Nucleic acid binder design. Structure first.
Length: 58
DNA sequence: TGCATCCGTGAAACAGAAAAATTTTCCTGAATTTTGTATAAGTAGCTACAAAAT
């Protein structure tokens, strides 16, 4: 096991860093620019509730 | 035509030559001090001198 665990590690290290690096690239400059905005629509929410297990107190 | 493969990504030659270069020489030339040298007064000195304070 332990080996497996190891070599893995040695990898998913990058894999992450990699991401962000994308993420940040794609999501790089949504900067708050502006209080005016407008609109009154949004979106709903509800606790996350796999099975009666409710993951997240709303 | 979805389905092959399949690009290519993110992770030792020489001798004889010559001609160059270069480079030491020169020289020189001039340019550039210094000094001589005047220079010319004015001088600031300086040296007596005089009356009047130790």
């Amino acid at each position: 096991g332990a080996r497996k665990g190891l070599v893995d590690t040695a990898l998913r290290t990058a894999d992450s860093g990699y991401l962000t690096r994308r993420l940040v690239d794609v999501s790089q400059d949504v900067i708050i620019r502006e209080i005016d905005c407008g609109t009154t629509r949004g979106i709903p929410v509800r606790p996350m509730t796999e099975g009666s297990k409710t993951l997240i107190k709303l």
